[PDB]
Design an enzyme around this catalytic site. Structure first.
Site, PDB file in Angstrom:
ATOM      1  N   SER A  27     -16.258  54.036 -14.017  1.00 38.95           N
ATOM      2  CA  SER A  27     -17.356  54.768 -14.882  1.00 38.95           C
ATOM      3  C   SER A  27     -16.981  54.562 -16.048  1.00 38.95           C
ATOM      4  O   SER A  27     -16.092  54.996 -16.910  1.00 38.95           O
ATOM      5  CB  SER A  27     -17.110  56.203 -14.578  1.00 38.95           C
ATOM      6  OG  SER A  27     -16.124  56.645 -14.414  1.00 38.95           O
ATOM      7  N   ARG A  74     -17.820  55.483 -18.740  1.00 40.70           N
ATOM      8  CA  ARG A  74     -17.777  56.618 -19.742  1.00 40.70           C
ATOM      9  C   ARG A  74     -16.261  57.256 -19.649  1.00 40.70           C
ATOM     10  O   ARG A  74     -15.807  57.688 -20.802  1.00 40.70           O
ATOM     11  CB  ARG A  74     -18.826  57.704 -19.260  1.00 40.70           C
ATOM     12  CG  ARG A  74     -20.174  57.434 -19.737  1.00 40.70           C
ATOM     13  CD  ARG A  74     -21.110  58.370 -18.964  1.00 40.70           C
ATOM     14  NE  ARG A  74     -21.273  58.309 -17.610  1.00 40.70           N
ATOM     15  CZ  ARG A  74     -22.334  57.332 -17.077  1.00 40.70           C
ATOM     16  NH1 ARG A  74     -23.371  56.809 -18.086  1.00 40.70           N
ATOM     17  NH2 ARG A  74     -22.456  57.164 -15.863  1.00 40.70           N
ATOM     18  N   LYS A 113     -15.227  68.953 -16.389  1.00 35.95           N
ATOM     19  CA  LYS A 113     -14.188  68.424 -15.654  1.00 35.95           C
ATOM     20  C   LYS A 113     -13.198  69.525 -15.486  1.00 35.95           C
ATOM     21  O   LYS A 113     -13.082  70.156 -16.605  1.00 35.95           O
ATOM     22  CB  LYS A 113     -13.848  67.360 -15.774  1.00 35.95           C
ATOM     23  CG  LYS A 113     -12.655  66.845 -15.134  1.00 35.95           C
ATOM     24  CD  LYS A 113     -12.516  65.222 -15.165  1.00 35.95           C
ATOM     25  CE  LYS A 113     -13.352  64.542 -14.142  1.00 35.95           C
ATOM     26  NZ  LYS A 113     -13.265  63.076 -14.189  1.00 35.95           N
ATOM     27  N   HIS A 164     -15.742  64.608  -6.410  1.00 36.41           N
ATOM     28  CA  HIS A 164     -15.925  63.398  -6.062  1.00 36.41           C
ATOM     29  C   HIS A 164     -15.025  62.769  -4.915  1.00 36.41           C
ATOM     30  O   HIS A 164     -15.390  61.632  -4.588  1.00 36.41           O
ATOM     31  CB  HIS A 164     -16.100  62.532  -7.198  1.00 36.41           C
ATOM     32  CG  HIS A 164     -17.485  62.573  -8.257  1.00 36.41           C
ATOM     33  ND1 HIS A 164     -17.625  63.547  -8.980  1.00 36.41           N
ATOM     34  CD2 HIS A 164     -18.621  61.748  -8.165  1.00 36.41           C
ATOM     35  CE1 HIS A 164     -18.860  63.374  -9.736  1.00 36.41           C
ATOM     36  NE2 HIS A 164     -19.514  62.191  -9.135  1.00 36.41           N
ATOM     37  N   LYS A 208     -11.528  62.446  -5.573  1.00 39.61           N
ATOM     38  CA  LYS A 208     -10.319  62.518  -6.333  1.00 39.61           C
ATOM     39  C   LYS A 208      -9.928  63.917  -6.537  1.00 39.61           C
ATOM     40  O   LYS A 208     -10.302  64.817  -6.238  1.00 39.61           O
ATOM     41  CB  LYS A 208     -10.434  61.586  -7.480  1.00 39.61           C
ATOM     42  CG  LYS A 208     -10.953  60.240  -7.177  1.00 39.61           C
ATOM     43  CD  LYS A 208     -11.042  59.443  -8.403  1.00 39.61           C
ATOM     44  CE  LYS A 208     -11.864  58.188  -8.040  1.00 39.61           C
ATOM     45  NZ  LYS A 208     -11.113  57.351  -7.086  1.00 39.61           N
ATOM     46  N   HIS A 261      -9.921  66.006  -8.995  1.00 42.15           N
ATOM     47  CA  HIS A 261     -10.315  66.839 -10.213  1.00 42.15           C
ATOM     48  C   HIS A 261     -11.674  67.458  -9.855  1.00 42.15           C
ATOM     49  O   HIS A 261     -12.609  66.634  -9.461  1.00 42.15           O
ATOM     50  CB  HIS A 261     -10.300  66.365 -11.597  1.00 42.15           C
ATOM     51  CG  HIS A 261     -10.680  64.922 -11.356  1.00 42.15           C
ATOM     52  ND1 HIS A 261     -12.352  64.589 -11.129  1.00 42.15           N
ATOM     53  CD2 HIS A 261     -10.352  63.471 -11.408  1.00 42.15           C
ATOM     54  CE1 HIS A 261     -12.570  63.324 -11.100  1.00 42.15           C
ATOM     55  NE2 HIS A 261     -11.368  62.812 -11.419  1.00 42.15           N
ATOM     56  N   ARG A 264     -15.172  68.318 -10.434  1.00 43.89           N
ATOM     57  CA  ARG A 264     -16.138  68.312 -11.325  1.00 43.89           C
ATOM     58  C   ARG A 264     -17.195  69.559 -11.373  1.00 43.89           C
ATOM     59  O   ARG A 264     -17.062  70.189 -10.221  1.00 43.89           O
ATOM     60  CB  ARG A 264     -17.248  67.102 -10.761  1.00 43.89           C
ATOM     61  CG  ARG A 264     -18.097  66.623 -11.852  1.00 43.89           C
ATOM     62  CD  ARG A 264     -16.953  65.601 -12.721  1.00 43.89           C
ATOM     63  NE  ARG A 264     -16.420  64.469 -12.305  1.00 43.89           N
ATOM     64  CZ  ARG A 264     -16.985  63.326 -12.473  1.00 43.89           C
ATOM     65  NH1 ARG A 264     -18.171  63.226 -13.005  1.00 43.89           N
ATOM     66  NH2 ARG A 264     -16.505  62.200 -11.972  1.00 43.89           N
TER      67      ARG A 264
END
EC number: 3.6.4.-
Lengths: 313, 313, 313, 313, 313, 313
Positions: D107, D109, D188, D221, D223, D225, D227
């Site tokens: 990503s 971003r 996040k 997602h 992983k 962390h 969201r």
């Protein structure tokens, strides 16, 4: 300072005179005109733009090699001209006095400030026409009534009593003869009435002056309103006012002078102006100004301490 | 109003402490952070941005629900923090004094103005490092020599003769605790040398004060420099200084207090501060402040008149 | 927070009273005016600018020494004054009520929001004059109809139903007593029809409140409209309402308090206001506010979850 | 959404590969290049401006016929490229994995936020190089460390506990690929230490989330962390997180998935993601998302009320 | 693309319908309204701001979670609404057609361009009211006379000979439904008189098209005016017109189509639209668009050479 | 259009010549010099500002009574002068060729575009010094290599295949001899490799030219790069280049001409330039330009239709 012959000119009604202003471009053209040394006193005619003042006053307008004249390239010029017209036309002028009526001196700052306070929609010189008419009459000199608060020279109030009013002249927002210095500041103090003022009111005025404006001196040009200006210019005003009296000693001109209560006016300036109106010498009378003479620190006692202990809240 | 524990934190050099500033981002993070009890007075670690002061001081930082605290969102914060670092590091600190060394109160405006003074290259606090070090020591309180002119709190000069200097505090261009009020003008007056001052110099200072600043009242906070502030807040200072003495009557801090020459300091404030240091009551001692006195206008005689007739030319 | 005697003054027509606004310049002049005691509750006359309110209310105008009063140097002052004029003159006032008619307290922000509404030509307070009269007359407090949506205090809609309307007060573009904060957001909720409301509409409003504004608390001031403010100010409102009910336990003054449906109003605030209207202690009755008590976290079941699974598409 | 083949290209050290960025002018040139349908995947060489990506990626750069690709006409495109350099150059790359290591999705971003973070000189990704190196390795996918807080994707902190950190993604100041919507806001939440977490910290995080962010839903997602995004887009993420798993069911790429603690994550999203990991059907599994299943308002009780009566002071 | 139910609503004269616009603030209010089912297709009444369209059209207005509808916040909205009112009221609308008259599709950009041309005074839609009336009637679809040049949809003229006029639609200065794409240019070509046209005029138009606009393809939607748009958007128009013919196959609405001359229109598009109107397959008919069909390169011969050697002077 | 003697002058190294630029102030001073009519070609010495070119070039520099010269007051003048210095000094120059090597004509715009290309840090004329050196050499005419793409005259690429590059000259951002028109736009097309080009690449170039630039004609000034300019300015070039050949027919000057493939160049211009190099009359040969001769519309067939049908998807 200026003459009334720089804002209008007379025109025949077949009985009396209607006064009419000048055009910016017209006087602008006259400025660069050149005519023989025989007709340098009669009114000039900028054929394209209308009449224009004679070349005699050529040195009184803001030109390239002399910027110490009245600025005329601003709307304020036409405004003050229209005001002078609207005022003078009501007064029935004769054909034997108009010759000198159009030569009555006037500090154009007075008229400029009249205009500024006339276009504001809250000053009572906005509703009542006759008030403005009498005001401009006095500002020109065709009336006898001394200037009072209702007809004062404008500005913003900074202090008011039941018998006084302390205007703060703002000579930096003008557009005709604005002052070069950004530090020059001058206060006027006028009366609400013409009756003998009491003692409590004068006490309050003296308190406010010797407390909030102790860095200023209270003088008078001989009319009915206390001028107030920094000590660093007193010596100026004296000489500047001296001719105003001296040239009035010449016959045909009024020498009427109005000194005010010595309780508040600067006692040194009071004595100087008294010996002036007395008929004494030219400069030896002015000598009494620089003569340091002040046994009492302030004219009265126990007053500044009152405000000191008052504002503590 | 601020405590020294809002610009640095100690770090171990195995013999002493190196003091290190905070990252404004780190304090901003700790502000919106949360930690359980028992630890609200222990230094916090914004894991991303470094250390940050404990949440105890949470209500002492400029956030959108508490603007009564110091700002940190400007470069001035890091500047004053680096200055406090550069000063305290040289001073060898023990491991049993930093506990209350980092809690010595300080008028953050003092440090701010000293910073805005050290950056201008024309002042001697630009060349001589040791002078800057001594000045910051004084501004923190880790030395005994009272502030003199060479080490004053900055600002623009307004008047000096040989033993005095009249700084005009500019609390309107600061970026840490700028005064919201538009009319907050304060004049500090410091000495050029700690030796007993003559009488001619004091007479000249009193002349200039009671002429150009008669709308102010000379007071002192108990250190070695005359404060000057409008009467319209003098009462505040009394209470604002009262705790500063009262909270010093209890052990932990020194109750040392300095007066100045009774010939200039406002004699009402003089007597109030005298009966204050004497050890009398709390409010009945303040009562002497509102008690009208001084049956004369000014302490001296024939002084304002000298400046009156002086400036006439 | 203001009194009606700062927007207009009465004037005689030999039969009844016509109310006339002030000139901001005139009140600014009165501000500096000094008048003797024993008369400092009489309408002052700034000779140059017209009438001006008495010096009694001197401390209630935005000057350099008090920025905690109504600002008047903007056009909104004259706008709201002309609005109050157009309002009161229609109501035939006697000579035994204007004594306390010009003393009915009014939240100046309410009239400000009115005048910011009558000028936006989209609203119906632009067309129907009598609606505007009734609206501002309610905002002054001279009628018994509680405020409804048609006559609400303006602002931008943010939510509606068949019986409610949720205005979002914007107290940040005002010019008369604007909020200094940039983080003061307050919501009002008014009814469309004064008649009793159903249960489905209340369910919908409680859903929208506890979903989109769960960070807010629903209170009332004792009238026909739910105020809504952040919890972080409830306590304030409490005392700011208490005096309103306390000063009204004085006889000859209406103490009629309106509490709305408990089903939506904050149950703690509901019980507090109930025990208030019962008549009890000052602070020991307030103690019920700070008392945490919540058997069911929200008074309903199936609304937050309903909106959760609703907005999923 | 982007592939690593849009920021650099490999170059032979005769032993290993050095990765070199592109010239924005060179990619702009290739954009308008036209080559035969035989070499449309080979690296193209804009002879004037250095090598440029192959024409296959034509549809991935912003022109006036396809604006859904990256923006490179800004300085950031170089920075991130250089940032990738210092990442991949250190990691010794095999001549057999450069084939697919340059196709690891990322990503963009994320990298943009990280490069914004590395330039703010107060974050620890400004001092410690190896930390920045490890963070970029993670953001590319060449390591097993799940992204902790020290190596987080950056942004403004909003909330912090002893084990969590709530970044607020600011996708509106990005100059590479901003959001198609301009009201989009996404949070996040990362873990401070990869070790298991207690039950008090999680309860406080749940309180803060259900109080200040009850208008959001906590998803993941896969992983390490949490969201946090508005319900009004949660469905999107479903399909957006479906393919990235479904395409990983195609063996040859890791399908390692990590659903976090259930007590905080949205229970419906939790069950959906669980039945996703099980290997169930495609659409009948998503059917559990839209299906309303509300046993209890939250796996906790008495938290909203606690913060309610907490903030009251 | 819009429906007529988004600018006006009908109102009873007890005999006929007067159409009245929407207060943009009222529809902004309705947008947030939450009304029960079974009533979501009747005109809503924002009690404060007037009537507003039913909530059915909720998703057709530019808000922050749906920016794909018509903007209404701009003055152009009220302008086009007043135009539609001024046009429809003249037409004697019955009570059995208004139900479908208020639902005639209209490309809002057409009305926008018509109002932006009826304000520029030089246009003849400024002088002759009945011309403006007929033009708006056509743009709504309440007459049979196809759009001619006098009643064209405005824009800058680019080309005229005797029977054609090539407007350059400027869809980037619009304020209601502008094009988010920065680069979109689309020309229109209208006739000057519905009568058959000669061959010299058509040859001149084909010359100018195949010379100055070789990068465009001439198509028609089913009115009496050639569209002109880049080849890179032919396919779109195809399906965009397909439904227009397909949905009109349903009885009760006109399905007519006005194919223009075969000599200038894109012969492939000509054959495709002919096979469309023939009543054939859905997509197998569109396949004729991608299938390269060429009887000749260009329908004329030796024309571009004439303009080549013409402009050489 | 310029002569090399307007940016530098030679200076003796006691062995060879170092070329040194002028100071724009010095040449400006020389402009107003008045030297006797005996030395008007000797280099002038503005003794205050350093040497300046002879007064012969007096009318070649821009002044307010002749603006048809080359602007020199901008920084680009000194930039291009320093570039010419850096290039010429490396070249060993004799003492019998400096007489005319300083008079080889050069299109100042070429050197301007060189200097605007050399400062962009992404082009290979930034790294490789010798490349820039050879480029500035050929830009003066001191090399044999025809100007390939690696050494092209700069600009932004628009199209490349494998052996061509279509620069779009931007003669509007220049400062030395910028173009006053906003409609003037000129394209250059250079070869990448001087070896014979194949047929597929040429066909592709012809496709792109006769599709995207059919409103332009392809010519050549007699070097290795196709110019491309609007038909509306062919004739000018026809004469502008004519003298360039005619004045080269004079003995001692090279008249080498390089006409390129007739397949792509304008066949009429091809025949004209052929009969030019043949050695025929002045105007009777130009007559073949205005002659219209075009059996086939373009030298290829079935090509425009290819792109026509190609871009549809």
């Amino acid at each position: 300072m200026a003459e009334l012959a720089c804002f209008c000119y007379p025109h025949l009604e077949n009985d009396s005179y209607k006064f009419i202003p000048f055009n910016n471009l017209a006087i602008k053209a006259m400025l660069t005109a050149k005519v023989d040394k025989k007709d340098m006193d009669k009114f000039y005619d900028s054929i394209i733009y209308g009449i224009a003042p004679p070349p005699q006053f050529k040195k009184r307008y803001n030109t390239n090699d002399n910027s110490r004249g009245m600025n005329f390239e601003t709307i304020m010029f036409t405004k003050v001209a229209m005001l002078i017209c609207e005022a003078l036309n009501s007064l029935k002028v004769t054909q034997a006095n108009v010759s000198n009526v159009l030569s009555r001196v006037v500090s154009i700052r007075h008229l400029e400030n009249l205009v500024i306070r006339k276009e504001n929609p809250q000053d009572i010189l906005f509703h009542s026409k006759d008030l403005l008419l009498k005001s401009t009459l006095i500002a020109i000199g065709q009336s006898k009534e001394i200037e009072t608060t209702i007809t004062a020279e404008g500005g913003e109030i900074v202090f008011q009593n039941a018998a006084f009013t302390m205007w703060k002249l703002t000579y930096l927002e003008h557009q005709l003869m604005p002052i070069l210095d950004q530090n020059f500041i001058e206060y006027k103090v006028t009366l609400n009435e013409d009756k003998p003022i009491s003692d409590v009111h004068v006490k309050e005025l003296v308190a406010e002056l010797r407390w909030q404006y102790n860095k200023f001196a209270v003088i008078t040009h001989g009319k009915g309103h206390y001028r107030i200006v920094k000590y660093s210019s007193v010596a100026n005003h004296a000489d500047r006012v001296y001719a105003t009296f001296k040239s009035n000693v010449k016959t045909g001109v009024n020498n009427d002078f109005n000194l005010l209560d010595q309780r508040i006016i600067w006692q040194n300036w009071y004595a100087f102006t008294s010996s002036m109106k007395q008929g004494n010498t030219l400069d030896v009378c002015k000598r009494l100004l620089f003569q340091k003479m002040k046994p009492e620190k302030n004219p009265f006692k126990g007053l500044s301490t009152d405000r000191k202990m008052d504002e503590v809240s």
